[PDB]
Amino acid sequence: KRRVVVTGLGMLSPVGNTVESTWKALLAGQSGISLIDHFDTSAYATKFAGLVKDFNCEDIISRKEQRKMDAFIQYGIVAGVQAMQDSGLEITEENATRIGAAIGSGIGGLGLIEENHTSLMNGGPRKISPFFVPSTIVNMVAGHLTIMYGLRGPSISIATAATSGVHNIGHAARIIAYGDADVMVAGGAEKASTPLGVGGFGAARALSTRNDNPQAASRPWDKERDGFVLGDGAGMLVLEEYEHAKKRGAKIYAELVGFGMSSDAYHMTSPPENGAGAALAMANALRDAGIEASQIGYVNAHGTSTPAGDKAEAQAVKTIFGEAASRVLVSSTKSMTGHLLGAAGAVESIYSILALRDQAVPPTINLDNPDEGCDLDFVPHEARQVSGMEYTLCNSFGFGGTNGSLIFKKI
Amino acid sequence: KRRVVVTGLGMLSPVGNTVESTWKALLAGQSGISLIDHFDTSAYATKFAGLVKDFNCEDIISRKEQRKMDAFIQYGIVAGVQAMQDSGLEITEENATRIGAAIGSGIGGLGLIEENHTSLMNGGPRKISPFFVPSTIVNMVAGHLTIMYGLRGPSISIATAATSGVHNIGHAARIIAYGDADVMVAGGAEKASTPLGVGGFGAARALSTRNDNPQAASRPWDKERDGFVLGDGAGMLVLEEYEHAKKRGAKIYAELVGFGMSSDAYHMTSPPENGAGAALAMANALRDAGIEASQIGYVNAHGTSTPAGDKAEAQAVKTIFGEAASRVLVSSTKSMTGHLLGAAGAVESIYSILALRDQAVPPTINLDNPDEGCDLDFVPHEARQVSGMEYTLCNSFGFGGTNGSLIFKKI
Ligand SMILES: C[C@@]12O[C@]34C[C@@]13C[C@@]1(C=CC(=O)[C@@](C)(CCC(=O)Nc3c(O)ccc(C(=O)O)c3O)[C@H]14)[C@H]2O
Ligand SMILES: C[C@@]12O[C@]34C[C@@]13C[C@@]1(C=CC(=O)[C@@](C)(CCC(=O)Nc3c(O)ccc(C(=O)O)c3O)[C@H]14)[C@H]2O
């Protein structure tokens, strides 16, 4: 029976360009949201997002390679290198075949799709870049990282909108446990802060339009919430079979013990009031880990700051946790980071792991006036110290009603 | 130990709008390639593709729902309904939670991305459709089908370019065998015959430009080949745990016994001359099925009709099959159908299954003058009768060097 642990972490987020700088900012309640300046937002209903500040890949991706990739792939590669370096793993001819990748994105290369389509509109197909396809498609982060590191093992890329990060991490674990690999770099990357991304989610009436106070816009469970805040970045974890990790003296952050999935089978862009799908994903994760809901100390919620989405998840938590519901801590880090879409579940699994390490839980900031009739502890405003927390649970849900939950265990 | 069988099939292809009509055409050596007429190809180097003829969804997708989906999602839904209906499965409140979907696409909703981007360019973000996101993203076929059928089990969508079909089918099987589901509808759908699709792959110098003879363009292993031919369509399989299938008296087409994966770790859009990645995927699939290469009767190749790609796979087959290499039959149905990208591995797994049922193998048409120095039997020109074939193997490789192989067993 093969156990899977986490031995490396990598991350770029709106609140930090490393894992520790991001975590420090989150525990401190800092918002990473700001006004967009890279495109003219005059005509846009939403004019702000969680942007990666001063992204730097100079020493990581060559000048020749950079021009062949959309920003999301650049972010994914940088975060992936961080994780691989953090793991201390040394790739060999003997090892190569047993190390792979499971990395996705919800929307992929919007910036370069826009660039190529603009070129086509202005000057015909002759103006499309030879790199159009490999520079925009979802599986290109996995492609570059395997080439960069000489990884010959399984490589997949799950694209399930906001559920991607969790699905990719979960299936990388399954792949290891099944015996198809001993190591997998897994996660997600996204850079959807573009005219189509902002304009597209805006057309769906899904984004907050609180332009006059961007840092207060993302407010999960707060009565004045008005939609999600788009965030960019990437999160990557090196997952590794347990005995393999011990034998090389790897540093072990936590163990991945449960992975649950479900489908709402309700509506393409909204959950059912019941939160029944969210509940089933959590229950499935608990059963997979062989534990009871009461053993979870902290839930890093999907909690995007939408009127209906936040309510459905609160109902699902009440359902699964029953009597214990008020004793579990639940928080949405998207209150600070915004919604990283395909990378959300990746960066959030990292938060769920660090909460175990530090026995500290980041707050849901901006929760001034919570919805009435709910007794859950959403950790409003300020980080919380926890005591003997052994398990954390990370939820990530996506358009199409696809749900995923992961459970991490301390040590 | 949970075995997985195939109990339902669904398909739209350039040679037929049903599973049996497509198969009949393939065994007959008919090409499904024709000149494009839905957009002006004057400026395009490639002016032909494998198009779905007279696609009809009138009785399957409502008028209200049709306008919310790119053509690839429409194709995926129709094919998925065909498979679900073919399976005879009845969904119940008791069952719902154990039935899911693993369906992807390589590029997704190009037609609607182009439409929305054109609108944005012409009239600003206000002209973007509220449906932009849910109408184009890869996981939307799985989303619609789960809603349509009331499926509450696991839903994922793997987007690994041309490897998608095989990865999705393979991981749906893993999900069932793991115990997370008893049934999964799996496959892929694609409609990349658009200005960005044709112009994009054309910019990469990846497509055949034999405009004067479209039906002869796709010619895997032939000395005059000059790139792949884009094809549209969808393939779906209902996979089901064995005992569950028997208990309901399901019709069983074949059993899925092996799934192998690998990464080339060589180049973003080309395989290594060695074909080492392709070889490792096949070897991994053989090991997973617990069989030897000599037991495979037929390989449905990735064989896209590119100079370097076709050569690498022939080398990989020689490597894995050794002495037996000339005894195994290898064919590329893309010689007739064109390359269905994210749906290629799905429709091709269907062909690999029907070959077992009918003990007949479709030809690699157009193979007039094969590359020198290779003794493989590529089944040129004409279908072949086989005798006691018990296993078939389907290869599907993708940009980013991601490889996948599936092995089907008769009965
Ligand atoms: C048709 C509607 O769907 C949306 C476009 C609208 C108008 C809206 C009404 C209330 C709402 O609260 C939402 C804003 C979002 C629901 C949600 O939270 N949807 C949702 C989901 O179901 C899964 C994932 C995410 C994610 O952001 O990852 C997500 O936002 C809306 C509904 O009328
Ligand atoms: C840089 C190049 O990469 C491509 C754009 C070019 C110019 C080209 C030269 C020779 C070639 O034969 C290819 C045409 C395709 C290789 C291939 O077969 N590539 C390939 C692959 O590695 C995996 C999947 C697929 C698929 O079509 O699914 C695929 O075509 C070219 C190389 O210089």
* Gap between the Cα atoms of A164 and A344, Å rounded: 8
Please name which of B110, B41, B103, B52 lies closest in space to residue B76, comparing C-alpha atoms: B103
Q: Which residue of B has its CA nearest to A399?
A: B134
Cβ–Cβ gap B116/A196 under 8 Å: yes
Closest in B45, B117, B156 to A158, CB measured: B156
For residue B77, give both structure tokens.
């839904």
Closest-CA residue of chain A to B156: A160
A64 Cβ contact partners less than 8 Å away, ≥ 6 residues apart: none
Distances in whole angstroms, Cα of residue A287 to Cα of each of A131, A262, A280, A349, B173: 45, 13, 10, 19, 20
Q: What is the DSSP letter of B371?
A: P
Interface with chain B: mutation pick from A99, A136, A138, highest number of B CBs within 10 Å: A138
Contact, A208 vs A305, CB < 8 A? yes
Q: Do B378 and B400 share a structural domain?
A: yes
- Asked if B352 contacts B392 with a C-beta cutoff of 8 angstroms, the reply is yes
Please indicate, yes or no, whether residues B283 and B213 belong to a single structural domain of this protein. Answer: no
Q: What is the DSSP string of B88-121?
A: T----TTTGGGEEEEEE-SS--HHHHHHHHHHHH
Taking an 8 Å cut-off on Cβ atoms, the answer to whether B155 and A160 are in contact is yes
B185 within 8 A of B236, measured Cβ to Cβ = yes
Q: Are residues B139 and B279 both part of a single domain? A: no
- Report how far residue B318's alpha carbon sits from residue B315's, in angstroms, rounded to the nearest whole number: 5
Contact A43, A117 (CB under 8 A): no
Which residues from B are below 8 Å from A117, CB to CB? 113-114, 117-118, 196
- CA dihedral sign, ordered B328, B332, B333, B336: negative
- Whose tokens are 């020493």? That residue is A59
DSSP string, A37-76: -SS--TT-S--EEEPPTT---TTTS-HHHHTTS-HHHHHH
* Backbone conformation region of residue A305, classed left if phi is above 0, alpha if psi is from -120 to 50, else beta: left
Angle, CA B82 vertex, CA B76 and CA B83 arms, to 5°: 90
Closest CA–CA distance from residue B78 to any residue of chain A (Å): 17
Residue among B102, B398, B4 nearest A167 (CA): B102
From the CA of A341, the nearest ligand is 1
d(CA B19, CA B27): 12
Q: Where are the beta strands (DSSP E) in B105-224?
A: 155-156, 183-190
Asked if residue A106 lies in contact with residue B137, where contact means CB atoms within 8 angstroms, the answer is: yes
How many angstroms separate the CA of residue B192 from the nearest CA in chain A?
11
Residue A91: CB atoms within 10 A of its CB come to: 16
Angle at B231 between CA B229 and CA B234, to 5 degrees: 155
Residues B298, B389: contact at Cβ < 8 Å? yes
Contacts A68 to B, Cβ<8 Å? 268
Asked if residues A259 and A79 have their Cβ atoms less than 8 Å apart, the reply is: no
Ligand nearest to the CA of B338: 2
Instruction: Choose one of A199, A226, A258: the last residue of a domain.
Output: A258
Least Cα distance to A4 among A316, A258, A200 occurs for A258
Residue bearing tokens 């730097």:
A56
Quickly tell me which residue has 């980080």 as its tokens. Answer: A383
Distance (Å) from the alpha carbon of B379 to chain A's nearest alpha carbon: 30
- Domain end (from A238, A258, A278): A258
Report chain B's C-alpha Rg in angstroms: 20
Quote the tokens at residue B66: 């049709």
b (16+ CB within 10 A) / e for A13-36: bbbbbbbeebbebbbebbbbbeeb
A251 and A271, same domain (yes or no)? no
Q: Are residues B235 and B286 in the same domain?
A: no
CA–CA distances in Å: residue A295 to residues A233, A315, A318, A324: 31, 19, 15, 9
Other C-beta atoms closer than 10 Å to the C-beta of B197 total 24
Interface contact B156-A140, CB threshold 8 A: no
- Tell me which residue range forms the domain holding A239: 5-258
User: Resolution in A for the shown PDB structure?
Assistant: 1.9
Compute the distance between CA of residue A120 and CA of residue B269 in angstroms, rounded to an integer.
22
**Cβ-Cβ contacts under 8 Å, A104 against chain B:** 159
CB-side neighbour CA atoms (13 Å) of B53 = 13
CB B108 within 8 Å of CB B200 = no
| Contact yes or no for B187/B235 (Cβ under 8 A) | yes
H helices, E strands: number in chain B: 14, 14
The separation between CA B169 and the C-alpha centre of its own chain, rounded to angstroms, equals: 10
Q: Are residues A324 and A363 in the same domain?
A: yes
Backbone angles phi, psi at B162, to 5 degrees: -65, -10
What's the CA gap between A123 and A120, in Å, rounded?
A: 5
| Cβ contact B156–A161 (<8 Å) | no
| Contact between residue A274 and residue A393 where contact means Cβ atoms under 8 Å apart | no
- The contacts of residue B242 (CB under 8 Å, 6+ apart) are B2, B3, B4, B5, B255
Residue B283: count other Cβ atoms within 10 Å of its Cβ: 18
**Rounded to an integer, what distance in angstroms lies between the CA atom of residue B359 and that of residue A378?**
61
Task: Tell me how far apart the alpha carbons of residues B155 and A164 are, in angstroms, rounded to a whole number.
Answer: 11
Neighbouring C-alpha atoms within 13 Å toward the C-beta of B150: 8
Largest CA distance in chain A: 64
Residue A208 CA to residue A223 CA, distance in Å, equals 13
Q: Which of B44, B118, B160 lies closest to A139 in CB terms? A: B160
- Residue among A189, A153, A172, A231 at smallest CA distance from A57: A189
Residue with tokens 């395909």: A342
Owner of token pair 């290369």: A109
Backbone torsions φ then ψ of B173, nearest 5 degrees: -65, -45
Round to whole Å and give the CA distance between A46 and A213.
11
| Beta carbons of B157 and A158 less than 8 Å apart | yes
Q: Which residues of B touch A130 (CB under 8 A)?
A: 203-205
Residue with tokens 């005509």: A43
Please indicate, yes or no, whether residues A232 and A309 belong to a single structural domain of this protein: no
Alpha-carbon torsion (B46, B52, B55, B60), positive or negative: negative
Strands B384-385 and B360-361: antiparallel
Q: Going by CA atoms, what residue is nearest to atom 11 of ligand 1?
A: A308
Atom of ligand 2 nearest to the CA of B396: 28
Pairwise CA distance, residues A201 & A276, whole Å:
25
Specify the CATH number for the domain of residue A320.
Answer: 3.40.47.10
- Measure the CA–CA gap between A218 and A144, rounded to whole angstroms: 33
Query: What is d(CA A104, CA A338) in angstroms, rounded to the nearest whole number?
Result: 19
* Rounded alpha-carbon distances, angstroms, from residue A237 to A82, B282, B331: 9, 28, 40
Query: What does the alpha-carbon distance between residue A333 and residue A383 come to, in Å, rounded to a whole number?
Result: 11
How far apart, in whole angstroms, are the C-alpha atoms of residue B97 and residue B81? 19
- Cβ-defined contact of B277 to A152 (cutoff 8 Å): yes
Query: In sequence order, which residues have a C-beta less than 8 Å from that of residue A106 and are 6 or more positions away?
Result: A159, A160, A161, A162, A164, A188, A190, A192, A341, A342, A398, B137
Ligand 1 center to residue A269 CA distance, Å? 5
CA-based nearest residue in chain A for residue B131: A204
Q: Return the ligand 2 atom nearest residue A130 CA.
A: 5
Residue type, B42: S
Residue B41 CA, ligand 2 centroid: distance in Å: 23
- Strand A402-409 relative to strand A254-263, pairing: antiparallel
C-alpha to C-alpha distance for A87 and A24, rounded to whole angstroms: 20
User: Of A199, A229, A258, which closes a domain?
Assistant: A258
Nearest CA in chain A to B287: A180
Largest CA distance in chain B: 64
CA distance linking residue B61 with residue B144, whole number of Å: 10
Q: Tell whether A37 and A47 lie within a shared domain.
A: yes
Looking at the structure, tell me whether residues A80 and A181 fall in a common domain. Answer: yes
Nearest one of A95, A68, A189, A104 to A149, comparing CA atoms? A95
Beta pairing partners, A10: A236
Put simply, the answer to whether B139 touches A113 (Cβ < 8 Å) is no
Q: How many residues belong to chain A?
A: 411
* B188: chain A residues, CB-CB within 8 Å: none
From residue A148, alpha-carbon distances to A64, A66, A141, A296, B283 in Å are: 14, 13, 11, 38, 24
Please enumerate in sequence order all residues whose Cβ is within 8 A of that of A375, keeping only pairs 6 or more positions apart, or say none: A325, A326
Q: How many residues does chain B have?
A: 411
In this structure, the residue with its CA closest to atom 32 of ligand 2 is B270
Contact yes or no for A143 and B116 at CB 8 A = no
C-beta of residue B55 within 8 angstroms of C-beta of residue B17 = yes
Task: Output phi, psi for A148, to 5 deg.
Answer: -60, -40
Does residue A63 sit in the same domain as residue A159?
yes
DSSP character at residue B397: E
Which of B147, B195, B201 has the CB atom closest to A265's CB atom? B147
Instruction: Give CA–CA dist A140/A389, Å, rounded.
Output: 37
Instruction: Give the residue from B144, B253, B131, B225 showing the smallest Cα distance to B189.
Output: B144
Characterize A353-385 residue by residue with b for buried, 16 or more Cβ atoms within 10 angstroms of its Cβ, and e for exposed.
Answer: bbbbeeebbbbbbbbeebbeebebebbbeebbe
- Separation CA A312–CA A306 (nearest Å): 10
Strand, helix or coil for residue B188: strand
Cα separation, B231 vs B13, whole angstroms: 8
What is the number of H-type helices and E-type strands within chain A?
Answer: 14, 14
How far from each other are the two terminal CA atoms of chain B, in whole angstroms?
17
Handedness of CA B202, B205, B206, B209 (dihedral sign): positive
The amino acid at residue B351 is Y
Indicate yes or no: CB of B399 within 8 angstroms of CB of A130. Answer: no
**A362 in the same domain as A394:** yes
CA dist A344 and A13 (Å) reads: 10
Q: Is B388 exposed, middle or buried (0-12, 13-18, 19+ CB in 10 A)?
A: exposed
Same domain? For B170 and B291 the reply is no
Q: How far is the CA of A370 from the centre of ligand 1 (A)?
A: 19
What does the alpha-carbon distance between residue B141 and residue B137 come to, in Å, rounded to a whole number?
Answer: 9
What residues in A contact B118, CB-CB < 8 Å? 117, 121
Question: For chain B, what percentages of helix, strand and coil (3-state, to nearest 5) are there?
Answer: 40, 25, 40
d(CA A87, CA A187): 15
DSSP assignment of B230-250 equals BB-EEEEEEEEEHHHHHHTT-
Q: Is the dihedral of CA A29, A231, A344, A354 positive or negative?
A: negative
Residues of B in contact with A198 (CB under 8 A): 125
CB neighbour burial string for B120-149, b if at least 16 within 10 angstroms, e if fewer: beeeebeebbbbbbbbbbbbbbbbbbbbbb
Give the helix/strand (H/E) hosting A369.
none
Check if the beta carbon of residue A178 is closer than 8 Å to that of residue A190.
no
Computed on alpha carbons and rounded to an integer, the radius of gyration of chain A in Å comes to 20
Q: What's the domain count of chain B?
A: 2
Are A399 and B151 an interchain contact pair (Cβ–Cβ within 8 Å)?
no
B402 Cβ contact partners less than 8 Å away, ≥ 6 residues apart: A139, A142, A143, A146, A155, A156, A157, B160, B161, B163, B167, B261, B263, B264
Element (H, E) at A408: strand A402-409
Question: DSSP code of B387?
Answer: S
* B43, B201, B268 ranked by CB distance to A124: nearest: B43
- Tell me the residue type at B308: A
CB burial of residue B377 (10 Å; 0-12, 13-18, 19+): middle
Show Cβ contacts of residue B271 under 8 Å, excluding neighbours closer than 6 positions: B264, B277, B278, B308, B309, B312, B313, B397, B401
A313's tokens: 């998840």
End-to-end CA distance of chain A: 17
CA–CA min distance B380, chain A (Å): 31
- Spell out the residues 6+ positions from residue B155 whose beta carbon is closer than 8 angstroms to its own: A160, A261, A262, A263, A400, A401, A402, B100, B101, B102, B139, B142, B143, B146
Q: Starting from the CA of residue B268, give the closest ligand.
A: 2
Contact A102, A336 (CB under 8 A): no
Q: Which atom of ligand 1 lies closest to the CA of A396?
A: 28
